[PDB]
Amino acid sequence: TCEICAYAACTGC
């Protein structure tokens, strides 16, 4: 649902 970044939902991560 996102790249390997904190926000699973990719909320401007």
Method: NMR
Cα 6 to chain centroid distance, Å, stands at 5
Dihedral, CA atoms, 5, 13, 10, 3, nearest 10 degrees?
-30
User: What would you report as the CA-atom Rg of the chain, rounded to the nearest whole angstrom?
Assistant: 5
| Residue 4 CB neighbours (<10 A) | 5
User: Measured between alpha carbons, how far is residue 1 from residues 9, 12 in Å?
Assistant: 6, 12
Residue 13 CA to its chain's centroid (Å): 5
The secondary structure of 1-13, three-state, reads CCCCCCCCCCCCC
How far apart, in whole angstroms, are the C-alpha atoms of residue 12 and residue 5?
10
